[PDB]
Every structure is written in structure tokens, then in C-alpha cells.
Amino acid sequence: MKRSAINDILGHTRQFFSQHDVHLPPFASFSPAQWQQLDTAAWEEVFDLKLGWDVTAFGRNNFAAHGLTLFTLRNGSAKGMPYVKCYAEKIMHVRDAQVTPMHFHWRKREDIINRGGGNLIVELWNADSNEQTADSDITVVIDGCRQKHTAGSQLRLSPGESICLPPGLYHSFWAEAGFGDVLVGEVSSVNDDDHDNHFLQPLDRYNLIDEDEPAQLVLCNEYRQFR
Amino acid sequence: MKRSAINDILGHTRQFFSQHDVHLPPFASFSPAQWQQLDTAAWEEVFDLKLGWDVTAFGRNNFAAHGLTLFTLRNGSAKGMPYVKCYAEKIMHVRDAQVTPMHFHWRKREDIINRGGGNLIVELWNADSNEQTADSDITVVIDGCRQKHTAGSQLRLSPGESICLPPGLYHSFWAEAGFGDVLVGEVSSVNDDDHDNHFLQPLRYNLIDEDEPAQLVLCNEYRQFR
Numbered sequence: 001m002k003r004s005a006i007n008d009i010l011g012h013t014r015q016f017f018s019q020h021d022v023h024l025p026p027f028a029s030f031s032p033a034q035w036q037q038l039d040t041a042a043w044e045e046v047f048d049l050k051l052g053w054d055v056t057a058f059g060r061n062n063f064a065a066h067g068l069t070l071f072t073l074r075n076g077s078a079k080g081m082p083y084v085k086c087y088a089e090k091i092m093h094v095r096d097a098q099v100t101p102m103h104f105h106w107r108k109r110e111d112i113i114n115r116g117g118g119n120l121i122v123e124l125w126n127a128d129s130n131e132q133t134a135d136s137d138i139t140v141v142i143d144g145c146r147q148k149h150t151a152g153s154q155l156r157l158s159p160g161e162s163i164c165l166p167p168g169l170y171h172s173f174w175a176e177a178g179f180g181d182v183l184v185g186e187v188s189s190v191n192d193d194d195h196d197n198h199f200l201q202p203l204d205r206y207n208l209i210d211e212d213e214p215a216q217l218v219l220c221n222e223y224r225q226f227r
Numbered sequence: 228m229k230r231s232a233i234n235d236i237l238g239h240t241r242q243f244f245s246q247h248d249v250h251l252p253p254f255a256s257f258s259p260a261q262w263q264q265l266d267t268a269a270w271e272e273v274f275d276l277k278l279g280w281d282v283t284a285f286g287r288n289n290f291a292a293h294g295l296t297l298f299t300l301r302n303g304s305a306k307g308m309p310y311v312k313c314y315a316e317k318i319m320h321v322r323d324a325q326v327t328p329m330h331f332h333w334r335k336r337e338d339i340i341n342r343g344g345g346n347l348i349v350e351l352w353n354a355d356s357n358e359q360t361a362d363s364d365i366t367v368v369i370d371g372c373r374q375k376h377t378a379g380s381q382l383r384l385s386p387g388e389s390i391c392l393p394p395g396l397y398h399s400f401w402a403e404a405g406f407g408d409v410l411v412g413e414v415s416s417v418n419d420d421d422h423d424n425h426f427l428q429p430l431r432y433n434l435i436d437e438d439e440p441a442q443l444v445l446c447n448e449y450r451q452f453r
């Protein structure tokens with residue numbers, strides 16, 4: 001991905017968030033220059049837990065088809081130390097027909113929430129012992145309602161609705177094509193994108209960046225030179 | 228507390244949520260009749276974990292001065308079983324200058340989030356050995372920024388901002404007078420209002436006068452529906 005495309009994607013996403021009356025903490029708008037002037041001792045949690053912006057094309061080269069834009073609002077340490085918080089929250093922008101590829105988490109339990117806009121389609125499979133998709137029925141809770149469904153069921157979450165995905169449950173999601181971008185909330189146990197994502201297909205969760213123009217914002221995986 | 232006032236409060240809060248592009252799950256709008264027709268086996272989690280509406284005057288007689296309106300969206304079991312989820316989420320309506328009294332939690336750690344509207348003022352004190360307010364400095368993290376402040380500090384959360392409150396940290400909050408109602412988010416570890424709230428001034432309870440039919444069911448009155 002080009003830095004220019006990342007600037008453009010983030011600019012559009014901030015607008016989409018504003019459109020839905022979503023408000024972000026001040027650090028969401030810090031320029032790289034502003035990050036450079038911070039007291040690094042006070043901001044360790046941001047750097048350590050990778051709070052902030054995340055843009056990915058999932059190791060492929062068509063963001064519009066396979067991609068996700070996220071902001072990590074809060075989090076705890078993967079092991080529990082030194083940040084004891086057991087919970088994390090993200091706010092995300094899923095563009096019309098944009099797909100997050102099939103994956104499960106080893107540890108993280110997450111509630112994926114349609115906070116507004118279009119319709120979020122979520123496809124679910126149990127994992128078998130080979131870590132492939134199994135043919136067994138899935139059992140999930142959608143807003144406190146427990147239900148069983150066929151392997152590979154595609155479930156529609158309308159605005160307001162949420163599904164709890166336990167660890168080991170394979171999920172893929174997209175904004176239903178033509179029904180508009182979706183504002184997705186995720187409230188979960190601690191998030192660890194370095195180690196806690198198992199994609200059905202082998203793929204890189206972060207992208208390398210073609211620095212073709214100056215960065216307007218800093219991504220959550222690139223703080224290292226600001227700490 | 229009159230059901231008519233509860234009906235009204237909830238009606239206004241639903242509009243406020245809607246004006247802030249907040250969308251609630253289907254069960255947020257179930258009438259008592261609809262609750263009566265649910266498959267009780269499929270909905271146990273709602274009942275057991277007290278998901279849904281909560282309206283409180285904190286056992287006092289002036290909702291406008293001391294009160295809160297909440298909707299518990301998700302939760303887990305106080306003791307980790309049988310609902311293993313470690314996290315909870317509420318969305319709340321804090322009316323202009325309406326106060327939530329000083330309290331701490333034994334167990335719950337919570338991020339209090341200004342999701343929109345006016346400004347939220349949060350007052351903070353460490354709890355003493357005797358569960359009184361201590362004079363020690365407080366150490367808090369506001370959106371990943373760690374800072375130390377004096378006992379009893381009043382901190383302003385503008386829309387977008389959030390503060391993490393560890394267990395045992397006394398807190399009280401209100402919408403800054405004149406800046407308007409605040410939409411408050413709460414993302415936390417498991418919520419248990421039955422056992423996990425210690426108010427500085429102990430709470431003393433209201434019952435509901437059913438002067439009109441209830442439009443909605445509160446999270447503390449599921450008893451009849453399971």
C-alpha cells in the first residue's frame with residue numbers, strides 16, 4: 001500500500017465516523033510532528049498496546065475488495081502485564097462489499113457490532129482439528145439470543161445488532177453489497193494482532209508501506225520511532 | 228417511582244440515542260407482551276446477566292438531580308461461570324447537571340467514555356482503608372495518557388475522550404452544567420450491580436407505582452418472564 005492511499009483512506013474514514021456522530025480521542029488526529037513532541041513516558045500505553053489507526057489490505061493488493069480500517073480505542077496486555085485490563089474496544093469502517101477474510105482467534109472473544117449504516121454479513125464456521133472449516137453446526141449468541149445454525153451460515157446484522165464470536169470460531173465479514181458502508185464496533189477481550197489471528201489462507205495482517213508522500217497520521221504498528 | 232415517569236424518561240432517552248445515531252438491539256424495544264412470548268431457553272443470557280434498560284434515582288426522590296439512564300448491551304458472569312465473557316458494555320444518557328453519586332467497585336474496572344453531547348465531569352478519590360475518600364494523589368489513564376492528579380480532582384471528558392477507572396477508585400460524574408446532555412459509553416470487565424457497587428453514602432430503595440402500563444421492561448424486573 002502507498003502512504004498516499006493510506007492518507008486518503010483515513011481521511012475518508014474520519015469523515016464517515018463524523019457522519020455517524022462518532023467522536024475519537026485527541027490522539028486520533030495527531031500528525032507525526034505532534035507525536036514527536038509528546039512526553040513518551042506518559043504515552044507508553046498507546047505504543048505498547050498499539051492503540052490507534054490500523055489500515056490493512058490483508059497482504060493482497062485490492063484494498064477495496066479485501067481490506068479493513070480500524071481504530072483501537074482501548075486494550076490490555078496480551079499476557080496481563082503490565083496493562084491488566086481484560087477488555088478492548090475498536091471502532092471500524094467496513095466499506096460497501098469490502099471483505100475481511102476468514103479467520104479465528106486463539107484467545108480473543110469478540111462481540112462484533114453493527115453500530116450503523118449498511119448491513120453486516122458475517123459468515124461462520126467451526127474449525128476442525130486440521131484448522132480447516134468444519135461441517136458441524138455453529139452455536140452463537142446474537143444480542144443475548146442463543147441459536148444454532150448450519151456450517152457456513154451467512155448472518156445479517158442490521159444496525160444495533162451484535163454477535164459474540166468465541167475463540168476458535170472462524171468468521172469472515174463484509175458490508176452487504178450496495179447497502180452502504182458499515183460502522184462496526186468491536187468489544188472484546190484483549191486484542192493481539194501480532195499473534196492472535198489465524199487466517200484460513202496464509203496472509204500478512206499488516207502491510208509494508210510505499211512512502212510516496214508525507215504521512216498525515218501515524219498507524220498503530222509504526223510508533224517505534226516516536227517512543 | 229411512577230411507571231409514567233419511567234415511560235417518559237425512556238422515551239426521551241431513546242430519542243436522544245437516535246439523535247446521536249446510536250442503534251440498539253431488537254430486545255431494546257420489546258413490549259412486556261413481546262417478552263411474554265419469548266422462547267425462555269434461547270434468551271437466558273439476557274435475564275441472567277440483566278442486559279437492557281436501567282433507570283435509577285439512586286434510591287432518592289429527585290431523578291433530575293441524582294439519576295442515570297443506562298442500557299446494558301453485553302456482559303458476563305460475576306464469577307466467570309457459566310457466562311465466561313470477561314467484558315461488558317453499557318450506553319447511557321446523562322442529563323444536563325444530573326449527578327451519579329460517589330461510588331467505587333470492588334471488582335469492575337471500567338472505561339467511562341464521552342460518546343457525544345456535552346462534557347462529562349468526573350470527580351475522583353482513592354478509597355481509604357475505611358472506604359472513605361483518601362487524600363492521596365490519583366493516577367489515571369485518559370485515552371492511553373497516564374497522569375497523576377490531586378485527590379478529588381474534577382476532570383473533563385470532551386466528546387471522544389475516555390478514562391479508565393480501576394477497581395477501588397471512587398468516582399462521581401455529571402454533564403457539565405449548561406453544555407447539554409452527554410451520551411456516555413462504558414466498556415468494562417463484568418458488571419454486577421447486585422454486589423459490586425459501594426457508594427460513599429450507602430444506598431434507600433424505590434419500588435414502581437404502575438400508574439400506567441409499561442412500554443418497556445427494566446433489567447431488574449425479568450423475574451416474571453423466565
Ligand SMILES: OC[C@H]1O[C@](O)(CO)[C@@H](O)[C@@H]1O
Binds near residue numbers: 103110171193197205
Ligand atoms: O485480521 C483480524 C482482524 O479481524 C478482527 O478480529 C475483526 O474480526 C479485528 O479485530 C482484527 O484486527
Ligand SMILES: OC[C@H]1O[C@](O)(CO)[C@@H](O)[C@@H]1O
Binds near residue numbers: 424
Ligand atoms: O449503580 C452504579 C453504576 O455506576 C456505574 O458503574 C457508572 O460508573 C454504572 O455502570 C453502574 O450501574
Ligand SMILES: [Mn+2]
Binds near residue numbers: 103104110
Ligand atoms: Mn476477528
Ligand SMILES: [Mn+2]
Binds near residue numbers: 398
Ligand atoms: Mn462506576
